[PDB]
Amino acid sequence: MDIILGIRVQDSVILASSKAVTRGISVLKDSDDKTRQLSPHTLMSFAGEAGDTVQFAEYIQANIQLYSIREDYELSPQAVSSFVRQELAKSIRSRRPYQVNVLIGGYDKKKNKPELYQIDYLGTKVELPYGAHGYSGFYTFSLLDHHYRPDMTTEEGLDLLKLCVQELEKRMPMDFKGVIVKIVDKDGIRQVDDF
Template structure:
């Protein structure tokens, strides 16, 4: 029942995740954060089996931070997505593969551009202008196809996200307890009051 959305804009990336943590038909928490900050300018949103998601996200976060400490160099969002894809692909060949779908958004401080990568549990990695996992993909993809433009600024991106939320609230039979929205830009990662 998770909602994971990402929109790449001209100057930032917007990542939105549902606040509800569910198990079956029960809502366990109404303030869950399904994201992990991987570096100063990159963020990972995840969905999937509850144990796998947290364990995998913390594993990726720890390895990215370890690389940053050892090399004194922040990995680009593309490099982080490549590392994450490699870890998902390796786990697929193990006895207990991770059942995790991921969005990685970030701002490349060297190239001065935004990045949004869509990864699934099979190790597929693709860079997209907008992406969704979970039930959000069923209801918002056509809306994003229709209204997305490459030159959107932050305010216009948040308005597009509001259209997506309205569609989700109308169509989804479950209350996902609202969205936690984070923006990644040149200044880093910040939470937006949405």
């Protein structure tokens, strides 16, 4: 898939992911949701090779849901991200590796802190205030480097995100058909239905 962005503000993590699905010549869909809820306060967006993306995401989702039921407890975003990293690190030396890059946006209820983790298909994990995969960072990071403040509100985060998407829509050759935006905070996960 194409553009996935993430930004961690004061009290939430915001993930923006493109809606287009292109199979070579034609755009087959323009409303695709490139994300899975792993737990009530943890969201994962993804992009990479066709098929492997959803297969990997749903596999992770199933494993975290299994853990949640077994222990009657939600794993911290850090713990979930480490589990995901290991799976991708394991995968890279497999017979056929998962070609999947992910962003994990979670709200840690223990620490009362939002957390954003960026993990590529090699199992390269970094915790960031804002992140992206593919070429998305090339267009957006200069704007984020300038405007980002750790004490931003969710509304300010969304405005900075709009500026990033506008720059992408201007300078990117591909039409990614806009983005679905989701917010992760203390109350859980919700979708911004007008963006």
